[PDB]
Design a protein around this nucleic acid. Sequence first.
RNA 1: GGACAUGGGUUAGUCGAUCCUAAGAGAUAGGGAAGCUCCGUAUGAAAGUUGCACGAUUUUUCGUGCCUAUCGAAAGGGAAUCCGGUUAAUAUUCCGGAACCAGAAGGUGGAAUCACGGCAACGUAAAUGAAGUUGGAGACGUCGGCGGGAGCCCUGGGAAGAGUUCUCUUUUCUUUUUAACAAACCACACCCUGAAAUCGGUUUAUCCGGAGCUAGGGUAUGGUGUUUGGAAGAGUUCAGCGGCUGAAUCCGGUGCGCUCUCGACGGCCCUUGAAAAUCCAACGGAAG
Lengths: 98, 70, 97, 134
Amino acid sequence: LDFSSKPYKNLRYHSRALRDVSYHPSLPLFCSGSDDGDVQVFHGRVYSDLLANPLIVPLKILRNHKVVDNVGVLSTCWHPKEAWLFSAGAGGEIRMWT
Amino acid sequence: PRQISDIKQFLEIARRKDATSARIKKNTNKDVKFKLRCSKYLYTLVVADAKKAEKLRQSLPPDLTVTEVG
Amino acid sequence: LAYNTRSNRTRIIKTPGNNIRYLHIKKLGTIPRCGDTGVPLQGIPALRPREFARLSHNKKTVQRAYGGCLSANAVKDRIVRAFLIEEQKIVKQKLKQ
Amino acid sequence: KILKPGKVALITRGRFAGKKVVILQAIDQGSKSHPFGHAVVAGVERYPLKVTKSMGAKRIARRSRVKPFIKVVNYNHLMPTRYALELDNLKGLITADTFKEPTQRSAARKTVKKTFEEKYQSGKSAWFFTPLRF
RNA sequence: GGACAUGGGUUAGUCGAUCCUAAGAGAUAGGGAAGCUCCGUAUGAAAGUUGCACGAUUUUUCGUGCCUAUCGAAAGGGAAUCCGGUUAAUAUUCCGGAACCAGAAGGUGGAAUCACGGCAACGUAAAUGAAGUUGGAGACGUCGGCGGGAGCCCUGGGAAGAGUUCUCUUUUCUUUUUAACAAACCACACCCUGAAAUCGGUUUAUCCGGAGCUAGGGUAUGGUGUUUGGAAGAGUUCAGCGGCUGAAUCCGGUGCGCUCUCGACGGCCCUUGAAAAUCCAACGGAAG
């Protein structure tokens, strides 16, 4: 919001439509789940200093999630305490990524 | 003259070579106006708290020939 | 420019030096009109013919067949009339055959 | 009652004006999403070009390639025609979830394009695939 | 002395001309005439500034296809600038500050693999379009009333100074600024649901409605208005000090008011109301 109306950065790795994005409330991490069945886990470090732009780097590409009817990962949630991810699939499977 | 409300882009446009001179205005409302001269456009930024204003004084590059009130 | 004419349309404005000065305002632009109906098209801002070049491609044409040159109602009528006329030609050809 | 699945019709409103479409499913009973005489119709946005045997196989395939378009339009906007096209792959693939899920929409468009290319290869529905001048 | 003498004085990418055409004029083609010359302006002209494109180069002698004057407007049409300051004399020109237009290439970032969304009117940061074929702006009479905005005029306070003042007079007079431009937001034509007369909506002026009313939801056009930036650092007015330092430059209300402009109507037309330069768009699908 302090950079510009245009997005600060653009990221286009997902092979399918990006469904859900969630940022961890405390830890400087966030996740993105799409219908491709793969979840991208990135680290975003935010610095209150004006000179220090946010440091956004990839951290992991979670895989091995079932895709049904062109729909894979539907929603992702961050644990309130640590870097634990709840991933919901189209097959009724909930994956706890510790 | 584009009124600029994002401090970070005011910082990056200052570091970009197009910037030539910068002026700081202190009005009666205890607001600090950062005016940056570019090639075609004069970009201004209004901040209301002094500590952020002072922090952005020292965040500006030393090469920029900043000036005080006119 | 003595003998003021329609070109010299001046509006009085108050300057920051507490002085009244006349500023020449150019004629307002006209929105493009539909070719068939003749009513002005919808979605095209009314600017000058020279200033129309600066606008983007999407800002001057509507995203539809014959968009920006024929009205939507005219476009619907033209599409319907062509289909019916084609059917009549098909019907006439079958009867003649 | 003039609207039935598999019937060929023409769209007279919207961006895809004057484009021939086939009624995949009828929703004339009405729906919350479209409180009117809507129906799911799949049409062609880029009609296939003329094919010359002298031209290369890759060039022929590129010319024959057609971009389909699937959308729900009102009955008044559509215009029924006497001709009708029926395909096995076009039955049962239309559903509310298909339009709801963007990935399903892309998959449906890919399937429709594959079916249309097979029909063009089979040399059927030439009038339907041919663009209409207006 | 507008006399005489001697010197000084007119600064522009944005103001005008320059460009376009008007009625007409006019050279050229041809024809007259002893002749100075006249008629003639796409006329029985081989009327193309490199008319255009195509091609492994075609008997290394070029084949195929397509399309077929100039002058005349310093009041008509037309890309683009404002403010403050400055001279003995020049300012939209000069100084200071702030913009805008046109054209030119690369570069950087972003976008599509000839992009999506919305039932629709249509929207968006982008989203190729040859030949050939169209459409629009330019570009169009006049009159009346209504609506909107701006400035000017009127006026209530606030402030400042100058008055008048034995007394009365919270009183008298004067002033109280925001430009071009750039940002975000702010209302009659159409679409969707709808099917209407027990006629409704409604103008200052009864206009429209199964060729689809009232009503509800949208879409576009933003005349404008709101908030700023520009911008107080400027200008003005009071106080001082010796150029410098203080303050204020505010809040309203308004009207058949005047001036200018815009919007929405209503007539009268008749002879139904210049042209071109220029710009844009559509159909089209050559090519990759």
